[PDB]
Write an enzyme that holds these catalytic residues in place. Structure first.
Site, mmCIF file in Angstrom:
data_model
loop_
_atom_site.group_PDB
_atom_site.id
_atom_site.type_symbol
_atom_site.label_atom_id
_atom_site.label_comp_id
_atom_site.label_asym_id
_atom_site.label_seq_id
_atom_site.Cartn_x
_atom_site.Cartn_y
_atom_site.Cartn_z
ATOM 1 N N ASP A 180 -6.299 8.122 -0.729
ATOM 2 C CA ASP A 180 -5.847 7.125 0.240
ATOM 3 C C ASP A 180 -4.694 7.714 1.046
ATOM 4 O O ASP A 180 -3.806 8.353 0.472
ATOM 5 C CB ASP A 180 -5.359 5.850 -0.450
ATOM 6 C CG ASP A 180 -6.447 5.098 -1.170
ATOM 7 O OD1 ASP A 180 -7.637 5.249 -0.818
ATOM 8 O OD2 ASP A 180 -6.102 4.323 -2.091
ATOM 9 N N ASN A 216 -8.967 5.188 3.044
ATOM 10 C CA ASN A 216 -9.655 6.078 2.080
ATOM 11 C C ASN A 216 -10.530 7.168 2.691
ATOM 12 O O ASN A 216 -11.239 6.904 3.667
ATOM 13 C CB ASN A 216 -10.511 5.246 1.134
ATOM 14 C CG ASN A 216 -11.067 6.067 0.002
ATOM 15 O OD1 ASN A 216 -12.199 6.545 0.083
ATOM 16 N ND2 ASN A 216 -10.283 6.253 -1.045
ATOM 17 N N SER A 238 -11.624 10.506 -4.307
ATOM 18 C CA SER A 238 -11.158 10.307 -2.951
ATOM 19 C C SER A 238 -9.639 10.176 -2.970
ATOM 20 O O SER A 238 -9.013 10.155 -4.036
ATOM 21 C CB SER A 238 -11.809 9.077 -2.329
ATOM 22 O OG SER A 238 -11.411 7.913 -3.032
ATOM 23 N N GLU A 265 0.822 -1.200 0.000
ATOM 24 C CA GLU A 265 0.000 0.000 0.000
ATOM 25 C C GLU A 265 0.861 1.257 0.000
ATOM 26 O O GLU A 265 0.592 2.195 -0.760
ATOM 27 C CB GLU A 265 -0.945 -0.011 1.208
ATOM 28 C CG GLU A 265 -2.081 -1.055 1.075
ATOM 29 C CD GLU A 265 -3.104 -0.722 -0.032
ATOM 30 O OE1 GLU A 265 -3.016 0.352 -0.677
ATOM 31 O OE2 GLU A 265 -3.972 -1.579 -0.311
ATOM 32 N N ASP A 312 -15.597 -4.552 8.752
ATOM 33 C CA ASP A 312 -16.731 -4.108 7.943
ATOM 34 C C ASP A 312 -17.462 -5.270 7.271
ATOM 35 O O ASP A 312 -18.585 -5.086 6.791
ATOM 36 C CB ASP A 312 -16.217 -3.098 6.902
ATOM 37 C CG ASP A 312 -17.309 -2.532 6.012
ATOM 38 O OD1 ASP A 312 -18.124 -1.712 6.507
ATOM 39 O OD2 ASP A 312 -17.335 -2.894 4.812
ATOM 40 N N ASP A 342 -12.051 8.224 -8.334
ATOM 41 C CA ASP A 342 -13.356 8.728 -7.924
ATOM 42 C C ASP A 342 -13.295 10.074 -7.210
ATOM 43 O O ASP A 342 -14.351 10.595 -6.830
ATOM 44 C CB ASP A 342 -14.082 7.707 -7.023
ATOM 45 C CG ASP A 342 -13.413 7.501 -5.654
ATOM 46 O OD1 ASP A 342 -12.365 8.117 -5.366
ATOM 47 O OD2 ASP A 342 -13.974 6.729 -4.832
ATOM 48 N N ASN A 385 -7.488 8.699 -5.820
ATOM 49 C CA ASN A 385 -8.205 7.669 -6.548
ATOM 50 C C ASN A 385 -8.996 8.314 -7.685
ATOM 51 O O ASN A 385 -9.263 9.523 -7.679
ATOM 52 C CB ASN A 385 -9.130 6.923 -5.591
ATOM 53 C CG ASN A 385 -8.370 6.061 -4.593
ATOM 54 O OD1 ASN A 385 -7.414 5.355 -4.934
ATOM 55 N ND2 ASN A 385 -8.768 6.155 -3.337
#
Length: 129
Positions: A52, A59, A50, A35, A101, A48, A46
């Site tokens: 990280d 995120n 967003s 990562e 989650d 979209d 990202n």
């Protein structure tokens, strides 16, 4: 801070990541390697909109607030900048929430594509734990 492999392993252990939600410590070190290259300052935007953040590339669309992500939730209730600290407490606390989650560590695409099913114990071999 750019952590050493065994230095991050010891830090993740002290924070209770070893076998959290059933994931041995090498899973978390492998995830952090791919990562962030163990760099607490790592940020990546990202597609979209967003971003990280941190050693575990957490995120901003769901977990932290960076002030610029439409539809942001802030489920860890923390500014995303706290995830870039030399102290990994915030990143580990939020990660505990993420891995609970429902999808386990598949929430980290890099763990799924580069750690899952591999010899992850190699990532903590030789460390004083």
């Amino acid at each position: 801070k750019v952590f050493g492999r065994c230095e991050l392993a010891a830090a993740m252990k002290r924070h209770g990541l070893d076998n959290y939600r059933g994931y041995s410590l090498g899973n978390w070190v492998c995830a952090a390697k791919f990562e962030s290259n163990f760099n607490t300052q790592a940020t990546n935007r990202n597609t979209d909109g967003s971003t990280d953040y941190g050693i575990l590339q957490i995120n901003s669309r769901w977990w932290c607030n960076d002030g610029r992500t439409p539809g942001s939730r802030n489920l860890c209730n923390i500014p995303c900048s706290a995830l870039l600290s030399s102290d990994i407490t915030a990143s580990v606390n939020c990660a505990k929430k993420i891995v609970s989650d429902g999808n386990g560590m598949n929430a980290w695409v890099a763990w799924r594509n580069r750690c899952k099913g591999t010899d992850v114990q190699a990532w903590i071999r030789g460390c004083r734990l």
